[model samples]
Target: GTKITFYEDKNFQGRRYDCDCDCADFHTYLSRCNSIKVEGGTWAVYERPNFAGYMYILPQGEYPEYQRWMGLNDRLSSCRAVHLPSGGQYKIQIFEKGDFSGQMYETTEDCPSIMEQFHMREIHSCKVLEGVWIFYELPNYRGRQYLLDKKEYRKPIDWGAASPAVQSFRRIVE
Candidate 1:
């Protein structure tokens, strides 16, 4: 089972809320999120409600402060457990154009620099064929993140990105 705890104050202080499933709105239980603790499965936390806004993928661990999870602020409003695939298999196919058109690149490894590895700086579309993955707006896993499950994203919007600017990506393992 997946379990995660959010704290209203930094260093796991003040009010708290425990969640075992997807939550679209954390405002009902907590006014803000300054710290978090993941006790079970990996989780995808959002800066806004309804799973929108900047995302931060967190594995089971301790985050004493918002910065520990690379959060931009204390406005964490949503989160969902990442579904892990069995046998630790990870696969994905990225496209240079929207709707899976144009040049395509497939890989099962983490890409620190998509431009250097795939010879592309932007990924307009993609297909996650196995494990869950996180797409980063910049190389070296920095910048905005988008959690992607095993599915097909026909466009950048399908992955919650305003543009095709994925510079790096990596799988989420349990």
Candidate 2:
């Protein structure tokens, strides 16, 4: 099982709350979020209740402050476990064109820059065959991001990307 701890003050000081599942409203426990500690799973935290608003992905680790995770603010209203620890090969396939057409590249590890293998940074389709993966719009895992888990995206539209643009990718290493 996975566990996460939320703190109302920086460096894990002040009030605290622990969660093992999806939480729709964190305000009920702590007035605001300042720090977090993820024990065993990756999490997606939202700035608004009911899993709405801006999101910040939290991997398994310790975060002494919101800024440590690049959070815009201390207001966190919802959180949900997105990936759990598992011992298996992480695999994914990316296509250069929509509808799973065109050049393809597969990887079982993190690709800081996919352009090296595909000759292009644009990705229009993808398939997560074994583990959870996150795609970044810019190289080195920077810029806009998308997360997928054991799923297939035949078109870029299915991934909610405005265009077929992917520069980096990584699997959730539990």
Candidate 3:
């Protein structure tokens, strides 16, 4: 399979990250010039979806949760295995930051897969700012309730974090 990488390119007020200089734009971008080549076969951008949101990317009759790779944008960090490399290396460098506006990416895909490959970074004043990181299964996730300090909050941090005014997420996919 072809390899892929991800980066969180901005902060809440709308500014580009220094890591990419000003070279990056869009919550996500794919170029026609990129691809993966090997001896037996090659992998390239074959098709692009028509919409850029979860509603449009969802399967004909179901929601995004059951959809593979979470939807149309799924392929950004994804690649097809053409002839299949017998033996080789595969890796991905994922970067994610907490912000109000940027995380709501423009979708070329529609599912939960993006969440899995995304790496959550601890932005000093942001990480504990509060938000729910629901496990597709909850409890079993790395930052479980048991992992939170009781002295800091009454219940799990995930629960306390989400409120009427500061909702970092909703359960649409859950």
Candidate 4:
């Protein structure tokens, strides 16, 4: 299980909200997030509701102040947990449609460009069966990238993406 505690003021002060699942609206519980403490899994904190807008990924650690994470404003509205990868060989499957349907391709290597192997331009769903992955919006691992874990993303929105246009993906090797 994963848990994250959000503090309204810096240095672990002020109101607090402990979250173990995705939160759509945080304004009701917290006016602003200035500090945080995460454990058991990685987390993605969003500046807007429904896991949209600017996002910051945090692994298991203590962030006494928001400044610890560079470029993050003081306001935060939502957060979702990300499953951490277990130490082993990296592998993942990208699907062309939701619910693990449509065409699919599994890869264990860092594919800078998936078009050559999948013969497609976008991936709508994905399953990180063996390890964590980073999906890029464009080919060659360029453009916006998303950190994913050993879980199933039934759709683009399930992965916090506004579009199903994943062009490249790679395992989190470190």
Best by lDDT: 1
- What ranking emerges by TM-score with the best candidate at the front? 1, 2, 4, 3
Q: List, residue by residue over 22-60, the lDDT tens digit for candidate 2.
A: 888978889899999999778987788987765678888
Residue runs of model 2 more than 4 Å from their true location after superposition: 28-31, 84-87, 156-163
* TM-score per model over all chains: 0.96, 0.80, 0.16, 0.59
Cα lDDT for residue 60, model 4?
A: 81
TM-score of structure candidate 4:
0.59
> What is candidate 4's local distance difference test score?
0.80
- What lDDT does the true structure give each of the candidates? 0.91, 0.82, 0.22, 0.80
lDDT of 3 by residue, 1-174 (tens): 222222222111222111111122232443221111122222211123321112111111211221222323323222222222233322211113233223323222222343343333221111212221221212112121111111122222232333211212211121
Better of 1 and 3 by TM-score: 1
Candidate number of the best TM-score: 1
**Model 1, runs deviating above 4 Å:** none
| Global Cα RMSD, each model | 1.0, 2.7, 17.4, 4.8
Worst 10 residues of 3 by lDDT: 51-60
Score residue 130 of candidate 2 by CA lDDT: 85
